[PDB]
Amino acid sequence: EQRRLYDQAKAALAKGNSAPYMASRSALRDYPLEPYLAYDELTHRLKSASNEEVERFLTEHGDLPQIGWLKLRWLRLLADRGDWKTFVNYYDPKLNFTELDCLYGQYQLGHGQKAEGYATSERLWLVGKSQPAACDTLFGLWQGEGQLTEEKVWKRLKLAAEARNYSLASHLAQRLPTLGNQGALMVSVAQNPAQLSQTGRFSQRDHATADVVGLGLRRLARQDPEKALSLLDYYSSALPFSSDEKVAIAREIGLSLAKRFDPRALPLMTQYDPGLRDNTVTEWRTRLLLRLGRWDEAYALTRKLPQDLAATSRWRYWQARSLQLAQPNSKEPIALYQKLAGERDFYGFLAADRLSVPYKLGNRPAHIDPRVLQRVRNAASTRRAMEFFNRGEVINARREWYHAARLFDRDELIAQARLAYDMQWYFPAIRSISQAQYWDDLDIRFPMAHRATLVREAKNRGLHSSWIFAITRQESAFMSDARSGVGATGLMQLMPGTAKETSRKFGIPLASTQQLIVPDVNIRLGAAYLSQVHSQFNGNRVLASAAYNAGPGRVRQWLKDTRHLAFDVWIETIPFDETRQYVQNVLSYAVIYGQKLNAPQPIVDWHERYFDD
Length: 613
Hints:
Helices cover 63% and strands 1% of the residues. The protein has helices at residues 5-13, 19-24, 34-44, 51-60, 67-80, 84-90, 98-110, 114-125, 133-144, 150-162, 166-173, 180-191, 207-223, 225-235, 243-258, 265-272, 279-291, 295-302, 307-310, 313-326, 332-338, 346-355, 370-378, 380-390, 394-405, 410-422, 426-435, 442-445, 451-460, 465-475, 496-506, 519-536, 541-550, 552-558, 567-572, 577-596, and strands at residues 565-566, 610-611.
């Protein structure tokens, strides 16, 4: 039976008419999408629904992706009625609705859990953004019981200033009994911290003034770490900074100096994190030593790393490589690299390249227990996602797929990856197999859709065709209708102004921005634009890949005053975490695509291994 009661009842339900749905509830208790109509109908009359019916729906349909919205709305009703016993039976902190957390704090305050309710209030209060209305009620109760001290107003003011929510911060500032002056000063300094140059004005030796100054120096460090360091050197002896804020200031200044390759970062970072507690500071301390060519010290630092950093392929690679640079004639780096060859990521490729041994390129589909595959194809979320897919409701299908994945175990995730791959759903498949950390399936991890156009346009534009597959794999994971939050569209994630300029530059026809989700139009414009970035950086894929992600200007900035800089040092010392991983991904993917294209691609080409300013 091709039951079509569902689209009828959907039409009537949307909107107004619930009669067909109720008439079909038995005739559709097996159709997988039926809980969606039930969900809409219950939500519409939720203010009238019995506890019994709602509880029953949440009992039997707790797997719907949207069930949290139903709980939010119902729990809100339950609280508004004083149905506190039912509220706490169903309140879930893991829903991550601040509104429910605040209602729960109210429950604690009125039901003999004052100590816990105070702790809930303070945790929700110590937040730099405006909170929902129910939190205002909680804070009111908390303030009414004498807990909202000026110091707690001050703390939140600081958080609001840090988050650049100045309307909140200024409202908190107007609520300070004795500190209203310093509070206004905090807001002014947060908006323009360069005023800390007026050292004569920030001289009063109290903790409030030290808080104002510390916030300003942390802010100032983002864009002018050199000025921030000079001012720290003045203020350190003039203001009673706590030991904690001094470490925070120093670490933020040190990190920002190190990302500009300023060796003044090293003494500061060494003094304020001698025990290597801050992994970000440890890595940038090591990166900076590498940028400065201080191999001995970089090597000695890799020997002292905490376990979680020492275990990564990154610092296993740099331990071997800094040793080899510190001692070019030592045999000891060989064994170090050999531990790493065998790893299937960027640093494993680098280790193999340093040993001049072939790469590890095994394409091994996981063997799946037929019972686990059946389990996964039998799950209600999967069936719902299947039916959504066949009907074309692609966003609903994906949401089912992704929500279901949040509870699957490793074997199930692998089975889901196979099912999505066989539907030509490359990104869902890539997403699942990546969650499962099963890297040996190179068919799923590296789709070949639109191969003929990819190879042709690469050839037309003079590009290694593995590179364009790699860029596509990173940008969209081969979902040709992908669209980013800022408007980047299609296989190669083109901005519409970028696409129109490329179109005019090459004489490639582009009817509208909308055509950018047509794969061949995307690839033609994307290949052309990619070739422009490529020749702008002298055909160097490392630089051009970085520029694709961060822009040409940022890349030229990252090249200032370099000379014979090795490619692996340059990549490692890219200031943006995102761009560093982007580049390492694209280069690694191009190696894989080189094998699949029978056009071998080393991790970097001869002409890419060094480059200057």
